[PDB]
Design a protein around this ligand. Structure first.
Ligand SMILES: NCCCCC(=O)NO
Ligand SMILES: NCCCCC(=O)NO
Ligand SMILES: [K+]
Ligand SMILES: [K+]
Ligand SMILES: [K+]
Ligand SMILES: [K+]
Ligand SMILES: [Zn+2]
Ligand SMILES: [Zn+2]
Ligand SMILES: [Zn+2]
Ligand SMILES: [Zn+2]
Lengths: 341, 341
C-alpha cells in the first residue's frame, strides 16, 4: 500500500502547549512523524510519496469558510497585535453566550477554538494544508480502486470541528478524505475513529449528515479529553439520525473489551452500507501512552488492522494521535500489517 | 461612609496568568487592594472595618451549587492529580457540545470556566469567600439605612456567571450584594457596572430575572474581553425582559461620550424604580490602564460618583477591576469623593 507523506508537516513546530498549568513543549511534535515513517518503512511499506498540493474545494465542504480564513491569517494578526507568545485563546463562547463573531484577533481566536492547549504558531496553516493534501491524495487512491492506503497526516485532524481548532488539530483530515470520496462518486462513506480520544471534530462535521457514518471508540468523556462530546447517547440529529455511534470506555480498557466495541462498530458500518472506511488511526490507545488510559499491546494493532480490513471494503488509514514512546511507529506499522496481510 | 475590607484577600496570590501566549504575573494582584485602601484613607475615608464572616445562604440564590462545590475543592483536586502548575482550564464546552458535566478535575475545571486567563491557586476559595463577605456587609449597611458604603472586594466578581469563573472572578460579589438587599426587603435593585469590561457574569445571573436591572458601560465585545456578551441587543429574556441595558463603546472613548451613556443608564434605572444601586466599580476605564482602551482622567471619577449619587437612591460601591498603576487608588477615592460630596 502507498504511504502519502509531506515533509511540510515540519512547518508545524510549535514551541508551547498549555498542559498542567505550564507552557511546555508540545506532545504533538515533528519527531512523531519521523518515528512513524521509519517504522512503516522498516515493516516493508516503503512506497512513500509526497502528496500533490490541493486547494480548498474539498475542505470548504466540511469546514466553515470564515474558520479557514481565520486560520490563514491568525498568526500574522496575533504577531501584529504585539503579543509575545504563541497564539493561544483565553476567552471562549461557552454557556449562554452571544453567537456573534468578534472582530479582533483575541476574540476571534477564542471564537474559533475548542481547547486552549493548542497554540497557533508560524507555519501552522501551511503544515495543516500539507496534512490535508496527504489525506486527499490517499482518498484519491481509494477512489481510483486501491483497497488500502496510508496518509501519514501531521498535524492530526479529528478534534477540528466545523469551525473550531483544538486538541492539536486544525483541518479535519479524515473529514476531508471522506468528503473527497463522496465527491469522487461514493454515496455512503464511514469514518472509524480508533484513536484513544473522541473525534469530536469529526462528529461535529457529520452530526447532521446521513452520507457519512461516524463511529468512535474512546476514553469516556466524563474522564477524558475532549470532555464535552462522545457519550453513547449521541446518535445523530436530523438527516444524521442513526449515523453517529460512540463507544466510550473506561480506565484500563484492554483489547478483550475494546475489540468487542470494534466488532459492534463494524456491524453498524456494514448495516449502513459504507463503500469505504476512513480509519482515524491514533495509537494513543497503547498501554504506554503518556496521556491516555487504555491498555492495548503492540500485537493488538495487527489484530485491529486485520479486523477492520475484514469488512471487505477499501480502507484509507489517516494518522491521528499517539505520543511519547518509540513504539508509536511499531504500533502504526502493525495496523498496516494487519490490513495488508 | 464605611469601607468594608478583609485582609483575607491576600489568600488569592496566584503566580501565573495566561496573557499574550505567556504565563505572566497576574494583573489582579494583592498590591491593588493595598493601593486602593491607602488612597481611600488618604481621601478621608478611614472608617475601615473587616466584614463579618458569612455562610452560603445568599450566594446559593445567585450561583449554582455544583459550581460552588467545585470551587471549594478545585485546588486540592488539581494538586492531587499531579499537575505542576496552577489550575488552568484548557477544554471548554463551546458550540454544539454535550451539556453533561464531567467527573474529573480536568473536565470539571473547563466545564466551570469561561476564560483560561484565570488560574485557581491555593487560597483562592478562601479569598473569594472573604470578598463576598465584604459585599454582604456592605449590602447590610445599605439595608439598614446608610446611603453609601464601599466594599473593597478582591478578588473581583463581575465575570463570574451562574456556574462559571473567569476574568479574575470566582464569586459575583455585586450579584450577592443585590440578592442580599432583596433578602432584606427590597423588591427592585439595580446593578450599574462601570468597569471597562462587560459584567457578563452579572448579566448571566440576572438575565431572566425581573427584580434586578443590570446596566453595563464597557468596551465593545467585538473588540474587548469578555467578547461573547455585552451587545446592545441583549435586553433580557423571560422574566428579565427589558431589564438588561448594555452600552458598548469603542477605542479611545473619553468621558464626554462615556458620561452620555452613564446619563442614559441612570434614566433607565430610575424608570425601573430601583430602591438602591449596587455599583460595580472598576477603574480600568482610566487612560493609563494597561489592558483597557477608554480614556477617563482622574478628575472624571469625581464627576462619575456625583452623577451616580444624584439618583438620590442609596449606593453600594463594590470594587471590580483597574490595574497597573498606583493611581487606581486615587481613581477609586475620587468616585467616593463624588458620592460623599
Ligand atoms: N490535550 C489533549 C489533546 C489530545 C490529543 C490527541 O491525541 N487527540 O487524539
Ligand atoms: N483577560 C482579560 C481579563 C480582564 C478582566 C477584568 O479586568 N475585568 O473587569
Ligand atoms: K476515537
Ligand atoms: K453522520
Ligand atoms: K462594565
Ligand atoms: K434583569
Ligand atoms: Zn492497489
Ligand atoms: Zn488521541
Ligand atoms: Zn450612614
Ligand atoms: Zn475590568
Amino acid at each position: 500500500m502507498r504511504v502519502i507523506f509531506s515533509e511540510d508537516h515540519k512547518l508545524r513546530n510549535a514551541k508551547t502547549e498549555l498542559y498542567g498549568g505550564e507552557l511546555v513543549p508540545p506532545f504533538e511534535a515533528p519527531f512523531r512523524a519521523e518515528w512513524i515513517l521509519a517504522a512503516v518503512k522498516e515493516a516493508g511499506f516503503d512506497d512513500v510519496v509526497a502528496p500533490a498540493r490541493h486547494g480548498l474545494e474539498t475542505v470548504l465542504k466540511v469546514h466553515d469558510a470564515g474558520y479557514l480564513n481565520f486560520l490563514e491569517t491568525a498568526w500574522d494578526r496575533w504577531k501584529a497585535a504585539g503579543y509575545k507568545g504563541e497564539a493561544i485563546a483565553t476567552s471562549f463562547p461557552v454557556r449562554r453566550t452571544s453567537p456573534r463573531i468578534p472582530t479582533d484577533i483575541e476574540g476571534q481566536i477564542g471564537y474559533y477554538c475548542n481547547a486552549a492547549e493548542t497554540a497557533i504558531s508560524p507555519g501552522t496553516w501551511e503544515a495543516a494544508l500539507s496534512s490535508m493534501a496527504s489525506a486527499i491524495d490517499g482518498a484519491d487512491l481509494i477512489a481510483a480502486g486501491h483497497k488500502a492506503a496510508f496518509s501519514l497526516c501531521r498535524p492530526p485532524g479529528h478534534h477540528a470541528g466545523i469551525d473550531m481548532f483544538g486538541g492539536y488539530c486544525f483541518i479535519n483530515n479524515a473529514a476531508v478524505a471522506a468528503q473527497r470520496l463522496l465527491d469522487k462518486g461514493a454515496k455512503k462513506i464511514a469514518i472509524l475513529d480508533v484513536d484513544f480520544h473522541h473525534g469530536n471534530g469529526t462528529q461535529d462535521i457529520f452530526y447532521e449528515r446521513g452520507d457519512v457514518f461516524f463511529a468512535s471508540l474512546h476514553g469516556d468523556p466524563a474522564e477524558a479529553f475532549p470532555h464535552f462530546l462522545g457519550y453513547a447517547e449521541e446518535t445523530g440529529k436530523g438527516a444524521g439520525a442513526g449515523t453517529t455511534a460512540n463507544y466510550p470506555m473506561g480506565r484500563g480498557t484492554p483489547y478483550s473489551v475494546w475489540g468487542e466495541a470494534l466488532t459492534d462498530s463494524l456491524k453498524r458500518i456494514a448495516a449502513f452500507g459504507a463503500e469505504a472506511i476512513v480509519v482515524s488511526l491514533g495509537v494513543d490507545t497503547f498501554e504506554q501512552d503518556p496521556i491516555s488510559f487504555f491498555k492495548l499491546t503492540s500485537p493488538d494493532y495487527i489484530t485491529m488492522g486485520r479486523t477492520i480490513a475484514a469488512s471487505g471494503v477499501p480502507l484509507l488509514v489517516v494518522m491521528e494521535g499517539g505520543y511519547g514512546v518509540p513504539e508509536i511507529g511499531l504500533n502504526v506499522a502493525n495496523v498496516l500489517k494487519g490490513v495488508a496481510g
